[PDB]
């Protein structure tokens, strides 16, 4: 049973362009899974402490037959491969962040997983790249991505 998972990518440490390229190769190496498409690379000012570098943000469509937490096990390996240091606070810098934004049309609320990503509808740097690869996207609650964007004051992003 194949599902399309949409994954958000963020990086602002240790050459983000290399970090993201490495993440994309590794994402394709996930078993029972392959990349359908990927957005452009965007350069975004940090949401959080201002004394950190600008981010490279992107979105990826990953077709997969894995269970959601099985996929999470793989995306977390990828973060560690790129030296991600796990921390409690979540707005600081990192080599690589891989978040599952959407997993098919599923709503997931477990100890390890909240899908749709709890804050994605409030982050231009997640929505704009997603819109690039899925302009007709509809969230599980039925809102359209396009309507959200063109309705709220999301400044457009600059490319990397
Ligand atoms: N949709 C999702 N994708 C990835 N991880 C998720 C998730 N929902 C919950 N999590 C959980 O979030 C935990 C911490 O992940 P972190 O990457 O350190 C938070 P972050 O991405 O830096 O900030 P954010 O969640 O505000 O985007 C993971 O161990 C994972 O279990
Ligand atoms: N704090 C932040 N974390 C991640 S993963 N991506 C960002 N883009 C702009 N700010 C960001
Ligand atoms: Mg994140
Ligand atoms: Mg994360």
Describe this protein's structure:
It catalyses: 6-hydroxymethyl-7,8-dihydropterin + ATP = (7,8-dihydropterin-6-yl)methyl diphosphate + AMP + H(+). InterPro entries: Hppk (IPR000550), Hppk_sf (IPR035907). Pfam families: HPPK. It comes from Escherichia coli (strain K12). Catalyzes the transfer of pyrophosphate from adenosine triphosphate (ATP) to 6-hydroxymethyl-7,8-dihydropterin, an enzymatic step in folate biosynthesis pathway. The chain has 160 residues and is an alpha+beta fold. The chain has a single domain (1-160), classed as Alpha-Beta Plaits (2-Layer Sandwich). Helices cover 28% and strands 26% of the residues. The chain contains four helices and eight strands, in the order βαβββαβββααβ. It has helices spanning 16-28, 68-81, 124-133, 145-151, and strands at residues 3-11, 33-38, 42-44, 55-64, 97-103, 108-109, 114-115, 158-159. The strands form two sheets. Strands 1, 2, 3, 4, 5 and 8 form a six-stranded antiparallel β-sheet that branches. Strand 6 and strand 7 form a beta hairpin.
